[PDB]
């Protein structure tokens, strides 16, 4: 939103994600600030996924009980924030309305109020569709590349014929051969050793010098990092 | 499941030691012919 | 044959469906109330309906639209502009029309004795060239197929 | 509970013909015949009696593509390097095609029920894409009013707000009314009144789940009347 | 859906206007402490924020301050400068700032599909386990059996690859081994 | 000849073959005896009062 | 008072997710297979390569 209180949080946010996240939106064309919560809900659904919106979770939920159904939410809570009646300075009823608050919530009325108005109340209701289970006949496209790899094998047939037919109608020899089998002995040996040797096998997700000495557990221990792993050593 | 996260690649050494497979088994198709026609030399 | 698949090519009755005609052929249409989508023959590019109040016009297909609803998927895109530009069933055509012209110069060119080699080879490769053309067609019609 | 109920479909005598769709038998039979006529075209091309070598005509090679798609296996062999990719491609080709006909029907001869139809009310509150009414000014609607059973409560909330209004007039405008909707509405009423029903025609209905509550039926007199102890 | 009009809205008046989540609160919070209760609508329409130089509170804050407002039982979050002020409850309900994507359009078009079930791994170790018996066969045959018993087997290295093929591809083959070895 | 019983040993095989497992680790009981008028017409399971 | 300050600073927060997340030595593996079923692996049949 172009200014609310998720705009402030991530202006306070002393975390370097929060941050990187606060760098691109300071300085991105088309203005990635919104002027209002409904404009940035049509703003993504226009855009096809190559604009998502930041908004608190219960209107993330809302938006998907509606319809076109067509928005979802993601991720956890990046933060914890609360509703609270507000009630001025010596209130006749401030503490008993606390009170209040403490009974439906232990009653459980609060959320069976809450699981009640957004996920029934809601056009969407997405639990019948998400409960169709039917099989069906197998289409043409499921197996489309079956077909295909027919045809090209067909068509590879015929111009493998072709051209045999050709040089039929057009001599290996052995000191070719033997020469040919030095230098593929002498190949396979040296890439034999630079695969065991050299220690490339592997890109993933791995542990590097930042958790070098696997003893120490360095709280974070910036989790881990692309890792070059292979037979001998792992390395990133 | 999948590894998604990890990412999980093969990289160019384990290309290699593939290509050092399909070297090492033509080699060896290579020098059994040279047998059999010296073989049939012995014979001949 | 080589009049039968240009007559199939020059032609768009190949699909009968209940598609959009021409009264939604006017997009984002106000007041159309959807007009219930009556019979469509849908063609090699042309997506006129039938037994209509507005048939007898004709508008061609265009399989790409303004609005992508699902993102643009590459191997998806590689299909769509196989069907659209349909060069697979064109080429077929030309294949059958390559053969035609062996099978009349087969009676000439003599001692070549490979001129009806060459007609045997492009009946063939026009043939599948017809599969790969048909089986794009059921693809691209499994491909957003409706509710 | 009242629905309406589901289709038992008659399956053809061309049942078998379900896990692939008709546009893949038709596929299926025109790469049939394309192959069998590549590989006559690959067996036979005048190689340089070289051609006589080969035993491939296109009535063999008609038949050793249906040997392969069969699975039974044929007994002649290609032997020409075009010839073995041919029939290796088929070969793969047949291998995708026919074990997923295999297990499409395996999964096609398992049949389960419930999932169609509504379990019980409980289900009936789970999803509102079939709804439900009761009998005007019936004991069966004053029950659902006045049972605080948590299913019931939400039962009797939608019964509040429910356009076009569920509640109908009589017995048989309710049991029409299941028919009409084409199963897209469900209906509630006594057991008795059900059984009598669904055993008559058009035999559409059928009775969910169970009876919810028991009750009774009596014999009714004005409050002390004379009549009241002989008749019980 | 914390306060909301409905279609007879224009119809209804007083407490009966409006509905919701929150209406519904203000209800429940009622019967618990027997306060009759007047919905009021605010017209600035923004949360409760104290201004930069005219250092007011800005719509609800600012009516509950001022005495006008008794009670908001109203979507506001809990702040330090509200607080300060003004007393809060403890929260009812508990929000988090969350992430929406547009939906991402489902369906596998897979065309190379059919080789989903086994990984790339799979397929890779098969073609090579492939290419290792296709050689053995063939360097299990001919090894110098003993002119004519050398050149009497089939599988020259060419038939190898045949006849494992359509072993894999559970298709008859032609040749048959004919040796100890070979057979095994 | 050949091949439309080939083409019939291919469906009635993976029409048996389906889910052949299923019908051999089936444990469930036959309940042969129902009800009143089952137990009426046989005297070889006896009724107690 | 405090407590506001903290969670407005996320202090709060970042005490809590630093002590169970980090003391978390073991992985937390309340995913284990998500889908209910996925392809098969090459540890199922390695035995058969051997
Ligand atoms: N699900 S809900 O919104 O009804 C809901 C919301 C919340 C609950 C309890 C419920 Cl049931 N607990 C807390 C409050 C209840 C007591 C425990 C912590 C405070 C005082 N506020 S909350 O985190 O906003
Ligand atoms: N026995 C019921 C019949 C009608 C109904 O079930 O609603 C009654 O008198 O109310």
């Not at chain 1, 403490?102 to 009653?107: A, H, I, R, V, Y």
């Not at chain 5, 005495?67 to 400068?81: E, F, M, N, R």
Request: charged share 20%.
């Amino acid at each position: 939103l172009d200014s609310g209180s998720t705009k402030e949080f991530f202006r306070r946010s002393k975390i370097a994600v929060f941050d990187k996240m606060w760098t691109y939106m300071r300085s991105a064309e088309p203005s990635v600030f919104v002027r209002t919560t409904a404009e940035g809900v049509a703003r993504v659904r226009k855009s096809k996924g190559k604009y998502a919106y930041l908004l608190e979770s219960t209107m993330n939920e809302y938006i998907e009980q509606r319809k076109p159904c067509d928005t979802m939410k993601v991720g956890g809570n990046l933060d914890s924030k609360g509703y609270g009646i507000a009630t001025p300075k010596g209130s006749s009823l401030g503490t008993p309305v606390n009170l209040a608050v403490l009974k439906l919530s232990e009653q459980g009325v609060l959320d069976k109020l809450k699981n009640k108005w957004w996920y029934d109340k809601g056009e969407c209701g997405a639990k019948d569709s998400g409960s169709k289970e039917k099989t069906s006949a197998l289409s043409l496209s499921n197996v489309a590349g079956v077909f295909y790899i027919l045809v090209g094998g067909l068509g590879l047939a015929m111009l493998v014929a072709l051209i045999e037919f050709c040089y039929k109608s057009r001599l290996f020899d052995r000191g070719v051969q033997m020469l040919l089998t030095t230098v593929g002995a002498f190949a396979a040996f040296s890439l034999m050793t630079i695969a065991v040797g050299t220690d490339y096998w592997l890109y993933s997700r791995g542990v590097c010098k930042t958790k070098s000495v696997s003893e120490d557990e360095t709280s974070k221990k910036n989790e881990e990092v692309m890792t070059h792993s292979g037979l001998w050593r792992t390395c990133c | 499941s999948d590894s998604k996260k990890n990412s999980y690649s093969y990289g160019w050494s384990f290309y290699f030691g593939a290509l050092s497979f399909i070297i090492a088994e033509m080699v060896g198709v290579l020098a059994v012919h040279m047998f059999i026609d010296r073989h049939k030399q012995l014979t001949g | 044959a080589f009049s039968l698949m240009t007559i199939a090519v020059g032609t768009d009755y190949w699909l009968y469906s209940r598609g959009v005609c021409k009264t939604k052929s006017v997009s984002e249409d106000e007041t159309s109330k959807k007009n219930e989508e009556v019979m469509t023959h849908s063609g090699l590019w042309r997506t006129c309906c039938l037994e209509g109040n507005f048939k007898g016009l004709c508008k061609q297909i265009d399989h790409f639209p303004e609005d992508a609803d699902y993102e643009a998927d590459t191997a998806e895109y590689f299909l769509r502009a196989v069907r659209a530009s349909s060069i697979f069933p064109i080429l077929s055509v030309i294949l059958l029309f390559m053969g035609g012209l062996c099978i009349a110069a087969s009676e000439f060119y003599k001692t070549r004795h490979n001129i009806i080699l060459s007609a045997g080879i492009f009946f063939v490769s026009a043939g599948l060239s017809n599969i790969i053309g048909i089986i794009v067609y059921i693809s691209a019609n499994a491909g957003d197929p409706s509710k | 509970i009242m629905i309406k109920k589901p289709q038992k479909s008659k399956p053809g005598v061309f049942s078998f013909l379900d896990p692939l769709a008709y546009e893949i038998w038709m596929c299926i039979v025109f790469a049939y015949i394309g192959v069998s006529v590549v590989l006559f075209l690959v067996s036979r091309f005048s190689p340089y009696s070289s051609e006589s070598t080969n035993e491939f005509g296109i009535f063999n090679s008609l038949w050793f593509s249906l040997g392969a798609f069969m699975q039974q296996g044929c007994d002649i062999s290609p032997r020409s390097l075009s010839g073995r990719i041919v029939g290796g491609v088929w070969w793969f080709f047949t291998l995708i095609i026919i074990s997923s006909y295999t297990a499409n029907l395996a999964a096609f001869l398992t049949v389960e029920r419930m999932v169609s139809p509504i379990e019980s009310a409980e289900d009936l509150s789970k999803q509102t894409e079939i709804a439900y009414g009761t009998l005007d000014s019936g004991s069966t609607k004053e029950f659902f009013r006045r049972s605080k059973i948590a299913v019931f409560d939400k039962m009797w909330t939608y019964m509040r707000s429910a356009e076009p209004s569920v509640f109908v007039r009589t017995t048989a405008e309710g049991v029409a009314r299941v028919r009409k909707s084409k199963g897209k509405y469900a209906y509630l009423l006594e057991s008795t009144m059900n059984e009598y029903i669904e055993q008559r025609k058009p035999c559409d209905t059928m009775k969910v789940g169970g009876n919810l509550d028991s009750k009774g039926y009596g014999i009714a007199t004005p409050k002390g009347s004379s009549l009241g102890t002989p008749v019980n | 859906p914390y306060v909301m009009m409905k279609k007879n809205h224009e119809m209804l008046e007083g407490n009966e206007r409006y509905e919701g989540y929150c209406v519904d609160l203000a209800a429940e919070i009622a019967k618990h402490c027997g306060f009759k209760y007047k919905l009021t609508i605010v017209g600035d329409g923004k949360y409760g924020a104290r201004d930069a130089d005219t250092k007011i509170w800005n719509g609800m804050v600012g009516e509950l301050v001022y005495g006008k407002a008794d009670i908001a039982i109203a979507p506001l979050t809990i702040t330090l400068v509200r607080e300060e002020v003004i007393d809060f409850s403890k929260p009812f309900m508990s929000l988090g700032i969350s992430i929406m994507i547009k939906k991402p359009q489902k369906s596998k078009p897979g065309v190379f599909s059919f080789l989903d079930p086994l990984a790339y791994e799979i397929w890779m170790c098969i073609v090579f386990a492939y290419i290792g018996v296709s050689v053995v066969l063939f360097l299990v045959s001919r090894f110098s059996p003993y002119q004519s018993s050398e050149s009497t087997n089939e599988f020259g290295i060419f038939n190898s690859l045949w006849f494992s093929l359509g072993a894999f591809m559970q298709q008859g083959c032609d040749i048959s081994p004919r040796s100890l070895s070979g057979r095994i």
